[model samples]
Target chain A: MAEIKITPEELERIAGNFKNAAGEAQSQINRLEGDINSLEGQWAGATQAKFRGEFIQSKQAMQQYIPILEGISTDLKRIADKFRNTDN
Target chain B: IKITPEELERIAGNFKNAAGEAQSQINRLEGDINSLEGQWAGATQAKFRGEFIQSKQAMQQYIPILEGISTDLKRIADKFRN
Candidate 1:
């Protein structure tokens, strides 16, 4: 397998960063959904359609990154577990 | 459309972050593999093949983990490319 270019310290921080980002993404999703709920009724006009497009795009960006975080977390846990059994 | 400077920056950050996490795990795995390899090589001095085989088995456990992380990084790289 090919090796990654990250330094050991950087890798540690990256794992933590992914975990943190995952948390923030969850919060952002909730916030965006709430905004959609509150704004949907008030902005039901021409301007509303453009705003909806921006909202959908923003939500899509968050959704895209969230799955990536989950993938990272799963892989991280597996690596950690594999290390555990190896130390005998 | 192509990514703007800010979008590119965000992708760079994510790629670096993913690479860092994967590398950290691999570093730990390498340490374990190194220790097991040492055990496998040294077991002969104790006068039995069992210990040597056991050590080799421990070393073998790392193969799948290594492969999994390689795939992890490949996915991360592909996402970065997008």
Candidate 2:
């Protein structure tokens, strides 16, 4: 099979894809953070009417996903920048 | 003072519903984590698909390096397990 040839302009295209993907992934992380923060507030407010048992569980879930998401975002951005120098 | 039977029943129903909802949320969150795990793994090997103007320029060069790294990883996995 022939390897796909990447010209310099194509390099820019590839990088742009990576950049947007990273941006989105980062945005997801931010959104998750905001959600966790909101949930924490609700969970801590003892005076609230509904006693949400899932509050802690939801935060724990975020903790599990956040690191993985962050790692993907960081590594993707790092690797996506390499296309500029060479055809490979 | 002791609670009335009606009040007790109401509280019991609320707890049951809340517990069910909480369990469902937990299941959904776990599913999200699992889904994301697979996504992250595949993404490591994936080509850029969401290109924008600037990132396209930057990511073009990384393809070879990524492919090389991917090759080594595959080789190492094959050798180690063999």
Candidate 3:
């Protein structure tokens, strides 16, 4: 005989943590960008536009971040459910 | 001459902090996954293992970008200051 073990509850807990992390990260990025924009408002000269051009491109790239983590969280939950089903 | 160095530094801090926390979160997730990894084996588990790894790798790719942005801002602040 062979033994296999899994704790679906643990997986569920991890899923929640991942979701929470995702939310926090998204909030952080939004606020970070907001701060950047705020600085731009007070800034003048070529540096202002140059900074915006560079940072905005990076911001757009960051836009994909939340979705990826959200998918990870959702997948973890689904896997947890499957684990639970297999156990019972 | 209206720009503030502190603002640039503050924004840089945010980027670094965000990256740090993101890395921390991923670390915790990896730990949890490790705990579960040895507990089972098969198609379902295998599928999850691969998916999780791929997502994690992709996700981590942003950390460097964030750090670089922070560095850029910090340098810009110094350049503006003097």
What TM-score would you give candidate 2 relative to the actual structure? 0.28
Which one wins on lDDT?
3
lDDT of 2 by residue, A30-74 (tens): 543343343334322541212232333333433443444344344
Instruction: State each candidate's clash count.
Output: 1, 19, 0
Against the true structure, what is every candidate's RMSD?
15.5, 19.2, 3.5
lDDT of 2 at A58: 35
lDDT of 3 by residue, B1-82 (tens): 6767887898889888878877887788777666666676666567666766765765567677778888988997899887
What are the lDDT figures for the candidates, one per model? Answer: 0.44, 0.37, 0.72
Q: Please tell me what DockQ candidate 1 reaches.
A: 0.02
Candidate 1: what lDDT?
A: 0.44
Superposed by TM-score, candidate 3 places the C-alpha of residue A24 at a distance from the truth, in angstroms, of 1.2
Model 2, position B75, has a per-residue lDDT of 47
Chain A TM-score vs. truth, each candidate: 0.69, 0.45, 0.76
Error of 3 at A25 (Å): 1.6
lDDT tens string, model 3, A24-45? 7777768877866777657675
- Which DockQ-derived CAPRI band holds candidate 2? incorrect
On DockQ, the leading prediction is: 3
| Model 2 alpha-carbon drift over 4 Å, by segment | A1-52, B1-82
Position A29, candidate 1: lDDT? 48
TM-score, chain B, each candidate: 0.39, 0.43, 0.87
- Per-model TM values vs. the true structure: 0.41, 0.28, 0.79
- Model number with the top TM-score: 3
